[PDB]
Amino acid sequence: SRLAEFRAAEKALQEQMAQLEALKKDAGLKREIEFEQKLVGLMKSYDKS
């Protein structure tokens, strides 16, 4: 019921969302997303013969 526990959740959400903005900046994650887009498109073309 408390408003205090809402604003504690609001702060908890905005640091979670802040560390997702940190994760989003990692060079290793970026290389890995690209490699997946490569793998996805390559199995896209493997379909055709």
Next chain:
Amino acid sequence: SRLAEFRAAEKALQEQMAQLEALKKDAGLKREIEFEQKLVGLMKSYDKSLE
């Protein structure tokens, strides 16, 4: 991998944004915001009465 984690974090966050919005409906919370509202009105009035 850093990619599998990133997607579970993006999932755990999406869930949190939804559990937050669950709380906005509570009657108990709505009355507590009414009290803070009046408090602010009280504070504004105090400032207004300093011309």
